[PDB]
């Protein structure tokens, strides 16, 4: 568990990608989660409604994924700014700052 901080970021990114891919398997109230099945089974007036339900569900999932990606990007940016500060002050000089 020495390298837990990097592994946490790797696990979070992989889990977010897996969840985003997994969300395609959900029908979001439509008859099926497969677009080809809807297009081959139904006429376009009702297939439009089913595709619309799939589109709004997938778009909500993608917007949610982008939202946590931006929040994690802000956290990683803060950590990287701290790391750059440590590189400038601890490696390239001697720091009087305690801890």
């Amino acid at each position: 568990s020495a390298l837990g901080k990097l592994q946490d970021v790797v696990n979070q990114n992989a889990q977010a990608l897996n969840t985003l891919v997994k969300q395609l398997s959900s029908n979001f109230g439509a008859i099926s989660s497969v677009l080809n099945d809807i297009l081959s089974r139904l006429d376009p007036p009702e297939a439009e409604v089913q595709i619309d339900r799939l589109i709004t569900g997938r778009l909500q999932s993608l917007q949610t994924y982008v939202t946590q990606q931006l929040i994690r990007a802000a956290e990683i940016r803060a950590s990287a700014n701290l790391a750059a500060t440590k590189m400038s002050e601890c490696v390239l000089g001697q720091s009087k700052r305690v801890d």
């Binding site: 897996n18 891919v21 997994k22 398997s25 080809n36």
Partner: protein
């Protein structure tokens, strides 16, 4: 690039402009029907299971009950042909971003195109880890990074060099 950025002047850099998808050249149906075409991006219909992909010979060891194989993400990555009992991997067809590398329009109108994550044989040709680069000549000299391409590769204008 001008249409994407909604401007008649484009600054120096790399800009994501389009998406490249390898279109299905043929359609294949296999029922217990058409011929089996491998190593090409085709549409496939295996026992009512539809999809689009590249069919390759597989080294998997499917047990007799097992018919189609799923990966971690529950996508069909291997399938058994119902007529000749052989296993085929289904690699997804080559898709990637199309980015346009250009200097400023004040400097020049020459551009290069980067197909991200696409090998050069499925599309001044240079193969990078970031993707296939068309229109930029590769040099053995090392300079500072002007336009970032990726995987240690950068582009500049001096013609466009990579």
């Amino acid at each position: 690039t001008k249409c994407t950025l909604k401007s008649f002047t484009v600054e120096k850099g790399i800009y994501q402009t389009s998406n490249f998808r390898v279109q299905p050249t043929e359609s294949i149906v296999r029922f217990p029907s058409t011929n089996l075409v491998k190593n090409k991006c085709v549409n496939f219909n295996f026992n009512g299971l539809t999809g689009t992909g590249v069919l390759t010979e597989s080294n998997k060891k499917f047990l007799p009950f097992q018919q189609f194989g799923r990966d971690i993400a529950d996508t069909t990555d291997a399938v058994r042909d119902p007529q000749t009992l052989e296993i085929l991997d289904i690699t997804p067809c080559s898709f990637g971003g199309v980015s346009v590398i250009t200097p400023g329009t004040n400097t020049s109108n020459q551009v290069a195109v980067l197909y991200q994550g696409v090998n050069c044989t499925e599309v001044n040709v240079f193969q990078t880890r970031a993707g296939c680069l068309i229109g930029a000549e590769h040099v053995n000299n090392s300079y500072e990074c002007d336009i970032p391409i990726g995987a240690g590769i950068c582009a500049s204008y001096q013609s466009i060099i990579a």
